Amino acid sequence: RQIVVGICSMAKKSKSKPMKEILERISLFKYITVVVFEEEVILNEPVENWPLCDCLISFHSKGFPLDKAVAYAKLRNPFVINDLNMQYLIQDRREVYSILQAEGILLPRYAILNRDPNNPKECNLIEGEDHVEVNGEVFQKPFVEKPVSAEDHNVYIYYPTSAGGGSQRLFRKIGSRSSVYSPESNVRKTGSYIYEEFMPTDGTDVKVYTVGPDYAHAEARKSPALDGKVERDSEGKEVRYPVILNAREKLIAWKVCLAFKQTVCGFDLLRANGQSYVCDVNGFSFVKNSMKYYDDCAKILGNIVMRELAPQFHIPWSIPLEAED
Ligand SMILES: O=P(O)(O)O[C@H]1[C@@H](OP(=O)(O)O)[C@H](OP(=O)(O)O)[C@@H](OP(=O)(O)OP(=O)(O)O)[C@H](OP(=O)(O)O)[C@H]1OP(=O)(O)O
Ligand SMILES: Nc1ncnc2c1ncn2[C@@H]1O[C@H](COP(=O)(O)OP(=O)(O)O)[C@@H](O)[C@H]1O
Ligand SMILES: [Mg+2]
Ligand SMILES: [Mg+2]
Ligand SMILES: [Mg+2]
Ligand SMILES: [Mg+2]
Ligand SMILES: [Mg+2]
């Protein structure tokens, strides 16, 4: 019989153009059949009624019942491409940063301010005009303030008096905008946050997309905080610039992929002061315009499936060479 690769995610993702481009290529593997789990099934059917698969590609996004996916994987014991239990931790910036540190991955110097919403003034924060002290640790402006929820994209940057003060408020893109300037100079009064050193880049973010630990595609885009105007192309896509990862960065990608156990894993690098710092690890993420990425990604995923499952299915398999980017 065919090796079944099941795809289990919210329809917003499963039916996205990048996903459909990748799945059509995976389907070209002679011995692989792709089955995309319907959103109505994921949300409303007990996991005992979900389709069978031999290999499961499943990932959390807003509204996804991760508990069910974990229960399904437990029930059916498929080969799992992106580890499901780690996807709970990926939702928490504190957990993400803890893992990066444990792996010796460079990241911004940071401190966690946990607030008890019941008693919010009891927290370990002292604020001055050009700095904060979080658990006694001093962050001079510019510094960055991130909601502990990785799914909350309201990231604020605070400017020093020397640069005019105020703050830049970043958010999930709305049309042509990715951030706005605010005259507000004081930090947020409610919520729990990570405070971190601002890393000066050349005005671009590097977005990295792994497919297993030995492949990573990178591309750059204008830092959302710079002025907040999104650079769009004639097709309405964000303008993305060429990047080739150096040896250090290729190692970072290998570590991130393995440490988070996410074969397909997006993360962000800040190229600053002659090094590269990880500031965000997103897990399963979508490259949006590269035909070669779709080719490479589908081929690597198919080969991973074949290498793991062909012997069990009595299918001959010789593992081929794969590009590193
Ligand atoms: O990780 P993914 O593939 O799930 O996508 C993430 C995010 O990627 P990230 O994880 O690296 O931060 C995307 O940002 P980018 O890297 O393309 O700039 C964003 O696209 P966007 O803002 O629409 O950007 P445009 O298409 O307008 O240029 C998308 O937002 P939505 O589709 O509106 O929900 C997000 O989904 P979710 O987190 O569920 O809101
Ligand atoms: N420590 C930092 N120094 C400089 N810029 C940062 C820093 N942390 C985040 N940024 C900027 O803010 C953007 C959003 O932060 P990020 O941690 O990636 O949040 P998100 O999970 O919402 O994508 C980054 O892409 C980068 O441009
Ligand atoms: Mg096929
Ligand atoms: Mg996500
Ligand atoms: Mg959007
Ligand atoms: Mg990010
Ligand atoms: Mg993120």
Side-chain angles (χ1 to χ4, degrees):
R1 64 172 183 90
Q2 290 287 98
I3 296 156
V4 179
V5 173
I7 309 298
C8 177
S9 65
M10 300 301 274
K12 183 161 164 185
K13 308 302 188 186
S14 282
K15 301 202 289 193
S16 70
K17 191 165 200 188
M19 177 69 81
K20 298 194 281 200
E21 299 277 3
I22 287 147
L23 298 184
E24 71 185 351
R25 292 157 165 84
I26 294 176
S27 284
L28 296 167
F29 281 72
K30 182 169 292 203
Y31 298 101
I32 292 178
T33 300
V34 172
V35 175
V36 178
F37 295 12
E38 290 296 327
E39 185 176 280
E40 186 279 331
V41 172
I42 293 166
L43 300 181
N44 299 144
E45 294 277 0
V47 290
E48 285 72 32
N49 288 349
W50 290 15
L52 298 171
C53 67
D54 304 291
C55 172
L56 180 64
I57 298 172
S58 183
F59 53 97
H60 177 272
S61 65
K62 191 186 178 57
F64 184 77
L66 189 48
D67 298 2
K68 290 183 84 183
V70 170
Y72 172 87
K74 184 175 181 185
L75 180 67
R76 302 301 183 190
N77 199 23
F79 174 52
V80 177
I81 292 295
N82 277 41
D83 183 81
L84 292 164
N85 281 313
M86 292 304 282
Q87 297 174 23
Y88 291 111
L89 299 180
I90 292 164
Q91 296 176 61
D92 186 340
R93 298 194 197 271
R94 301 166 294 196
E95 302 288 345
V96 167
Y97 272 23
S98 178
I99 286 162
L100 295 175
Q101 282 194 292
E103 299 301 318
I105 293 162
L106 296 172
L107 80 164
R109 185 176 57 94
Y110 77 94
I112 302 161
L113 186 66
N114 293 314
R115 262 194 194 95
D116 188 9
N118 300 136
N119 35 85
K121 284 193 165 73
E122 288 205 57
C123 70
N124 316 287
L125 169 78
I126 298 282
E127 180 158 44
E129 162 198 319
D130 267 337
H131 81 280
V132 289
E133 306 172 19
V134 185
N135 318 308
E137 195 161 357
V138 174
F139 297 84
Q140 295 288 335
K141 297 187 186 170
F143 65 75
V144 190
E145 172 196 61
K146 306 175 178 185
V148 294
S149 174
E151 313 302 318
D152 184 336
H153 301 290
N154 296 294
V155 167
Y156 290 16
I157 308 187
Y158 295 85
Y159 300 120
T161 299
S162 64
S167 51
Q168 199 73 13
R169 302 182 174 176
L170 288 54
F171 40 81
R172 193 42 98 236
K173 278 172 280 181
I174 305 165
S176 78
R177 188 146 293 270
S178 60
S179 76
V180 67
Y181 179 78
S182 173
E184 179 65 66
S185 287
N186 296 334
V187 302
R188 281 178 275 186
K189 306 166 282 184
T190 68
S192 291
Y193 304 92
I194 294 181
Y195 291 88
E196 67 193 55
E197 275 205 348
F198 182 82
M199 312 307 288
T201 64
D202 68 354
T204 64
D205 289 344
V206 170
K207 305 288 280 171
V208 190
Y209 299 87
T210 74
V211 189
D214 291 345
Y215 179 96
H217 169 74
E219 50 190 45
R221 58 98 179 276
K222 177 190 175 175
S223 309
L226 236 183
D227 67 2
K229 187 75 154 161
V230 177
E231 303 176 322
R232 295 281 181 201
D233 68 19
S234 61
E235 290 296 287
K237 290 133 197 163
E238 179 174 273
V239 169
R240 291 285 166 108
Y241 301 109
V243 174
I244 294 177
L245 297 181
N246 63 32
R248 283 169 287 165
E249 292 168 329
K250 289 174 168 165
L251 182 58
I252 296 165
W254 178 95
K255 289 184 182 175
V256 167
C257 173
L258 292 169
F260 292 89
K261 308 174 200 173
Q262 303 301 293
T263 296
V264 180
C265 194
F267 69 94
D268 303 344
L269 286 172
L270 307 175
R271 283 174 164 180
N273 303 315
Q275 299 295 334
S276 301
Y277 300 82
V278 176
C279 69
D280 188 23
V281 178
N282 297 316
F284 201 107
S285 66
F286 291 98
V287 176
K288 279 176 199 178
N289 195 35
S290 169
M291 292 306 262
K292 183 168 180 295
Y293 172 80
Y294 302 145
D295 288 339
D296 288 345
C297 179
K299 284 204 199 83
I300 294 162
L301 292 177
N303 290 348
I304 283 166
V305 172
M306 296 303 300
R307 188 183 63 204
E308 182 68 27
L309 297 174
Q312 181 182 315
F313 283 71
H314 287 67
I315 306 169
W317 191 253
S318 171
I319 210 70
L321 301 184
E322 289 158 357
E324 294 219 308
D325 66 6

Short mmCIF file of all heavy atoms in Angstrom, two decimals, residues 278-302:
data_model
loop_
_atom_site.label_atom_id
_atom_site.label_comp_id
_atom_site.label_asym_id
_atom_site.label_seq_id
_atom_site.Cartn_x
_atom_site.Cartn_y
_atom_site.Cartn_z
N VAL A 278 19.23 35.04 17.52
CA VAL A 278 17.86 34.59 17.30
C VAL A 278 16.96 35.40 18.22
O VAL A 278 17.25 35.47 19.42
CB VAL A 278 17.69 33.08 17.59
CG1 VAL A 278 16.20 32.69 17.44
CG2 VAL A 278 18.55 32.23 16.66
N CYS A 279 15.89 36.00 17.69
CA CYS A 279 14.95 36.77 18.54
C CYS A 279 13.53 36.20 18.58
O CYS A 279 12.67 36.73 19.30
CB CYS A 279 14.90 38.26 18.11
SG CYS A 279 14.10 38.53 16.47
N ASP A 280 13.29 35.12 17.84
CA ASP A 280 11.92 34.62 17.64
C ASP A 280 12.03 33.25 16.99
O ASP A 280 12.81 33.08 16.06
CB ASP A 280 11.19 35.61 16.72
CG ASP A 280 9.70 35.34 16.59
OD1 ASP A 280 9.08 34.71 17.46
OD2 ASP A 280 9.13 35.81 15.58
N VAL A 281 11.30 32.26 17.53
CA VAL A 281 11.22 30.94 16.88
C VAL A 281 9.74 30.60 16.71
O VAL A 281 9.01 30.48 17.68
CB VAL A 281 11.92 29.82 17.70
CG1 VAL A 281 11.76 28.46 16.99
CG2 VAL A 281 13.40 30.16 17.90
N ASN A 282 9.30 30.48 15.46
CA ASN A 282 7.87 30.37 15.17
C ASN A 282 7.34 28.96 14.93
O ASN A 282 6.12 28.73 14.96
CB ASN A 282 7.53 31.29 14.01
CG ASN A 282 7.78 32.73 14.35
OD1 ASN A 282 7.42 33.16 15.44
ND2 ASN A 282 8.44 33.49 13.46
N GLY A 283 8.24 28.01 14.71
CA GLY A 283 7.82 26.68 14.26
C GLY A 283 7.32 26.73 12.83
O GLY A 283 7.80 27.53 12.04
N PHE A 284 6.33 25.91 12.51
CA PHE A 284 5.96 25.65 11.12
C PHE A 284 5.59 26.94 10.41
O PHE A 284 4.66 27.63 10.80
CB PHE A 284 4.79 24.65 11.03
CG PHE A 284 4.69 23.98 9.69
CD1 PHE A 284 5.05 22.65 9.54
CD2 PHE A 284 4.25 24.68 8.58
CE1 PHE A 284 4.97 22.01 8.29
CE2 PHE A 284 4.16 24.05 7.32
CZ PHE A 284 4.51 22.71 7.19
N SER A 285 6.35 27.37 9.41
CA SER A 285 6.01 28.68 8.87
C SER A 285 6.11 28.74 7.36
O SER A 285 6.79 27.92 6.75
CB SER A 285 6.81 29.80 9.54
OG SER A 285 8.18 29.69 9.22
N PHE A 286 5.42 29.71 6.77
CA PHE A 286 5.21 29.68 5.33
C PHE A 286 6.03 30.69 4.54
O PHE A 286 5.84 31.92 4.66
CB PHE A 286 3.72 29.77 5.00
CG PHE A 286 2.95 28.55 5.40
CD1 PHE A 286 2.24 28.52 6.59
CD2 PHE A 286 2.94 27.42 4.57
CE1 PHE A 286 1.52 27.39 6.96
CE2 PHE A 286 2.23 26.28 4.94
CZ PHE A 286 1.52 26.27 6.13
N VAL A 287 6.95 30.14 3.76
CA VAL A 287 7.64 30.86 2.70
C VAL A 287 6.59 31.11 1.65
O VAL A 287 5.79 30.23 1.29
CB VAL A 287 8.81 30.02 2.10
CG1 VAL A 287 9.48 30.73 0.90
CG2 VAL A 287 9.83 29.75 3.14
N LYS A 288 6.57 32.33 1.18
CA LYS A 288 5.41 32.79 0.39
C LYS A 288 5.64 33.04 -1.11
O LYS A 288 4.66 33.23 -1.83
CB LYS A 288 4.76 34.03 1.02
CG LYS A 288 3.79 33.74 2.21
CD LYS A 288 3.27 35.06 2.83
CE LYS A 288 2.70 34.90 4.24
NZ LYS A 288 2.26 36.23 4.79
N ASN A 289 6.87 33.06 -1.60
CA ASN A 289 7.02 33.37 -3.04
C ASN A 289 8.04 32.56 -3.85
O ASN A 289 8.07 32.66 -5.08
CB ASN A 289 7.19 34.89 -3.25
CG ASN A 289 6.97 35.32 -4.71
OD1 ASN A 289 6.13 34.76 -5.43
ND2 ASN A 289 7.73 36.31 -5.15
N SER A 290 8.82 31.70 -3.20
CA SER A 290 9.91 31.01 -3.89
C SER A 290 9.54 29.64 -4.46
O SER A 290 9.36 28.68 -3.70
CB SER A 290 11.11 30.88 -2.96
OG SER A 290 12.08 30.00 -3.48
N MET A 291 9.46 29.52 -5.78
CA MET A 291 9.20 28.23 -6.42
C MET A 291 10.28 27.18 -6.09
O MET A 291 9.96 26.00 -5.91
CB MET A 291 9.03 28.37 -7.95
CG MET A 291 7.75 29.12 -8.38
SD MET A 291 6.24 28.42 -7.66
CE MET A 291 5.64 27.40 -9.01
N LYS A 292 11.54 27.61 -6.01
CA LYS A 292 12.62 26.67 -5.66
C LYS A 292 12.49 26.16 -4.22
O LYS A 292 12.79 24.99 -3.94
CB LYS A 292 14.00 27.29 -5.90
CG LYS A 292 15.15 26.32 -5.60
CD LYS A 292 16.49 26.82 -6.12
CE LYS A 292 17.61 25.81 -5.79
NZ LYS A 292 17.84 25.67 -4.32
N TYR A 293 12.07 27.03 -3.30
CA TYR A 293 11.78 26.57 -1.94
C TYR A 293 10.72 25.47 -1.96
O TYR A 293 10.90 24.42 -1.33
CB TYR A 293 11.35 27.71 -1.00
CG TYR A 293 10.87 27.17 0.34
CD1 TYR A 293 11.80 26.80 1.34
CD2 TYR A 293 9.51 27.00 0.60
CE1 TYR A 293 11.37 26.27 2.56
CE2 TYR A 293 9.07 26.49 1.81
CZ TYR A 293 10.00 26.13 2.78
OH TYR A 293 9.53 25.61 3.96
N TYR A 294 9.61 25.69 -2.67
CA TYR A 294 8.56 24.66 -2.78
C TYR A 294 9.13 23.34 -3.29
O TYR A 294 8.85 22.28 -2.72
CB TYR A 294 7.37 25.13 -3.63
CG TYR A 294 6.71 26.39 -3.08
CD1 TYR A 294 6.18 27.35 -3.94
CD2 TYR A 294 6.62 26.60 -1.71
CE1 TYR A 294 5.57 28.51 -3.43
CE2 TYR A 294 6.03 27.76 -1.20
CZ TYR A 294 5.51 28.71 -2.07
OH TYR A 294 4.93 29.86 -1.55
N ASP A 295 9.96 23.41 -4.34
CA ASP A 295 10.63 22.21 -4.86
C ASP A 295 11.45 21.49 -3.80
O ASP A 295 11.29 20.29 -3.60
CB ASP A 295 11.55 22.58 -6.01
CG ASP A 295 10.80 22.97 -7.28
OD1 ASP A 295 9.63 22.58 -7.42
OD2 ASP A 295 11.41 23.64 -8.13
N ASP A 296 12.33 22.25 -3.14
CA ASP A 296 13.31 21.70 -2.19
C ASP A 296 12.62 21.15 -0.96
O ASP A 296 12.96 20.07 -0.49
CB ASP A 296 14.31 22.78 -1.76
CG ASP A 296 15.29 23.15 -2.85
OD1 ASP A 296 15.41 22.43 -3.85
OD2 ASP A 296 15.96 24.18 -2.68
N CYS A 297 11.64 21.91 -0.47
CA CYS A 297 10.92 21.53 0.73
C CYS A 297 10.15 20.23 0.53
O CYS A 297 10.27 19.32 1.34
CB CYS A 297 9.97 22.66 1.17
SG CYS A 297 9.02 22.22 2.64
N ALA A 298 9.39 20.13 -0.56
CA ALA A 298 8.65 18.91 -0.87
C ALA A 298 9.58 17.72 -1.05
O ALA A 298 9.29 16.63 -0.53
CB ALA A 298 7.77 19.11 -2.10
N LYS A 299 10.69 17.92 -1.75
CA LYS A 299 11.66 16.84 -1.97
C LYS A 299 12.27 16.34 -0.67
O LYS A 299 12.38 15.14 -0.46
CB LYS A 299 12.75 17.23 -2.97
CG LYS A 299 12.28 17.22 -4.42
CD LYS A 299 13.42 17.04 -5.40
CE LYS A 299 13.03 17.49 -6.80
NZ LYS A 299 13.18 18.97 -6.95
N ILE A 300 12.68 17.26 0.21
CA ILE A 300 13.29 16.87 1.49
C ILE A 300 12.26 16.16 2.38
O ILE A 300 12.57 15.12 2.99
CB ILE A 300 13.94 18.07 2.23
CG1 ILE A 300 15.13 18.60 1.42
CG2 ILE A 300 14.34 17.70 3.67
CD1 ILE A 300 15.55 20.01 1.82
N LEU A 301 11.04 16.69 2.46
CA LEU A 301 10.01 16.06 3.27
C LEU A 301 9.70 14.65 2.74
O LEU A 301 9.63 13.70 3.53
CB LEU A 301 8.74 16.91 3.35
CG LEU A 301 8.90 18.23 4.14
CD1 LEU A 301 7.61 19.07 4.12
CD2 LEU A 301 9.33 17.94 5.57
N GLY A 302 9.53 14.53 1.43
CA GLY A 302 9.29 13.21 0.82
C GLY A 302 10.42 12.22 1.12
O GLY A 302 10.16 11.07 1.47
#
